[PDB]
Amino acid sequence: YSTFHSENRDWTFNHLTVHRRTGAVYVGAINRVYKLTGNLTIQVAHKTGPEEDNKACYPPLIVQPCSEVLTLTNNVNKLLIIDYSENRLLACGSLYQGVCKLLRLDDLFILVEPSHKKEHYLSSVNKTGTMYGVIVRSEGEDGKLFIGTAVDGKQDYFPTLSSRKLPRDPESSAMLDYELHSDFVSSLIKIPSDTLALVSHFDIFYIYGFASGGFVYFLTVQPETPLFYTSRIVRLCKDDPKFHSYVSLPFGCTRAGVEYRLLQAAYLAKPGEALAQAFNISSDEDVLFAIFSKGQKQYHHPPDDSALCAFPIRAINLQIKERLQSCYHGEGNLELNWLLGKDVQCTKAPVPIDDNFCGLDINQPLGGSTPVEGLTLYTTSRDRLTSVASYVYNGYSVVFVGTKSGKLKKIRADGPPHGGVQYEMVSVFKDGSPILRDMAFSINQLYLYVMSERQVTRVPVESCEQYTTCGECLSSGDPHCGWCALHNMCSRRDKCQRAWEANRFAASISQCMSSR
């Protein structure tokens, strides 16, 4: 398999995205952002470090001279998003309190590196898996960036969640400015200092985020408030600069007496037929696939026991609506201690709560303590699940799941009884290193780009050729595979010469015979 090695064993890989039109592979790494061809040949290597820094220097070196002692510091890639409408890449690092660069897609030339305003500094956190962003731009206009990050106990320096202006012009003076910033109403959420005094390790880790319909969603993990942890879905309306639409519910999944409530990884996709039926949704609707490890404790040293589950966005929005309706009836409390700092009674008010409700000055920010439960598809306790991607093939949701021992599981989402069935597991990383969260399909869906800390590998979505009889091929459980009869070969339909002619491609067990 095509593979790209880190140039240094120390400068590990962080993030990966694939341009959905050109097919170029962009990789964010320590001290580097790379542009690779589809087969993982380097085209551009853009250097982001190392550099002289100290994270006690606020503001950074470019603005003021600093007082504390500097050390050569690696630049951890924290964020890597293609800004599609504008043919550029947003790359945010850990250096200098977490400044971002905008880079031209073609050659990674620096368009702008805003480093003079307080909001130009996203976060001084130097851990990955702590920040996530979503660009909302109606194609061809000025845009907005929702950015969620851990703040490292630096509550006043960095909001944990905010929206920023992402104008068309890279040199606009409004670049990364808050959408709204005023004395009492701003497009940002700060961690309150009282929560940090109560829970000293307190911080919020943003594992994933996506847009779906009129809303953006962030998936978070954080210490629980009076070591237990809570995984949550956080939702905002796309048009809500006041942030009155903030709602946060816990989420997780369970199966056969086990609870999985520590979020590891997630991926938004469309469901195949049987999964759509199990949810009573159409196959056109969005479904969130998520990996959770067992229980609610020791987040930083998780057990191998883990699960893949699935949440339709419709069901998420429904549970949020019923929460809003209840609260607006005066029932219960807001239930978001970490942000509200105390019990806050829900206030009864005559307000229509429909699907598109985006909050008012009361009853917000809204939480809850009843979790959104997912449909568990697959579980294991031998090899911890670490990443997920999914797509539809031959009417089946196919879910690819990375493990901590560098394997890739292929799971067919069949529905009851099992929910999902693993039909194959492949060794990707010889060294047995964990697969990292970011996996993305090539434009033609023929491959999934998968990565470890030291390698990016282009893994074919199928290797049907391994099956050497019609019977084995069609009994494999792999939705990609059928029997190319005249060429004595198991393959995808489109890899079978003259597949359209009668008896040339057997797509079922019984067709093995009729083909013969």
Structure tokens at 246: 């903030």
- Smaller CB separation from ligand NAG, 172 or 463: 463
Residues in 29-48 at the binding interface with ligand NAG, rule: CB under 6 A: 37, 39, 41
- Smaller CB separation from a second copy, 65 or 226: 65
Q: Any residues with CB less than 8 A from the CB of 130 and at least 6 apart, and which?
A: 78, 123, 149, 150, 203, 205, 206
DSSP strand pairing (88-92 vs 100-104): antiparallel
Which of ligand NAG, a second copy, none sits in contact with 37, Cβ below 5 to 8 A by type?
ligand NAG
**Distance (Å) of CA 442 to CA 24, 354, 378, 445, 489:** 9, 38, 25, 5, 24
Which of a second copy, ligand NAG, none sits in contact with 408, Cβ below 5 to 8 A by type?
none
3-state secondary structure of 471: helix
Least spacing, CB of residue 63 vs a second copy, in Å: 7
Per the CB < 8 A criterion, the answer to whether 210 and 346 are in contact is no
Q: Which stretch binds a second copy (CB under 8 A): 37-45, 47-55, 137-145, 188-196?
A: 188-196
Q: Is 64 in the site for a second copy (CB under 8 A)?
A: yes
Which of ligand NAG, a second copy, none sits in contact with 39, Cβ below 5 to 8 A by type?
ligand NAG
Per the CB < 8 A criterion, the answer to whether 319 and 304 are in contact is no
Q: Which stretch binds a second copy (CB under 8 A): 167-175, 195-203, 381-389, 487-495?
A: 195-203
Residues written for the chain: 516
Q: Any residues with CB less than 8 A from the CB of 300 and at least 6 apart, and which?
A: none
Least spacing, CB of residue 320 vs a second copy, in Å: 21
Total of residues contacting a second copy (CB under 8 A): 23
Per the CB < 8 A criterion, the answer to whether 235 and 217 are in contact is yes
- Smaller CB separation from ligand NAG, 366 or 459: 459
- Smaller CB separation from a second copy, 157 or 251: 157
Q: Among 7, 10, 106, 156, which residue interacts with a second copy (rule: CB under 8 A)?
A: 156
Q: Which stretch binds a second copy (CB under 8 A): 42-50, 61-69, 215-223, 419-427?
A: 61-69
Structure tokens at 342: 């105390």
Q: Among 153, 213, 241, 332, which residue interacts with a second copy (rule: CB under 8 A)?
A: 153
**Distance (Å) of CA 178 to CA 118, 198, 236, 237, 386:** 10, 29, 15, 16, 33
Q: Among 184, 256, 300, 416, which residue interacts with a second copy (rule: CB under 8 A)?
A: 184
Q: Residues before each break in the chain (C–N > 2.5 Å)?
A: 226
Least spacing, CB of residue 299 vs a second copy, in Å: 21
Q: Is 193 in the site for a second copy (CB under 8 A)?
A: yes
Is 210 exposed, middle or buried, given 0-12, 13-18 or 19+ CB atoms closer than 10 A?
middle
- Smaller CB separation from ligand NAG, 399 or 440: 440
Binding footprint of ligand NAG on the chain (CB under 6 A): 37, 39, 41
Binding footprint of a second copy on the chain (CB under 8 A): 59, 63-65, 67, 117-118, 153, 155-156, 183-184, 190, 192-194, 196-197, 200, 344, 347, 361-362
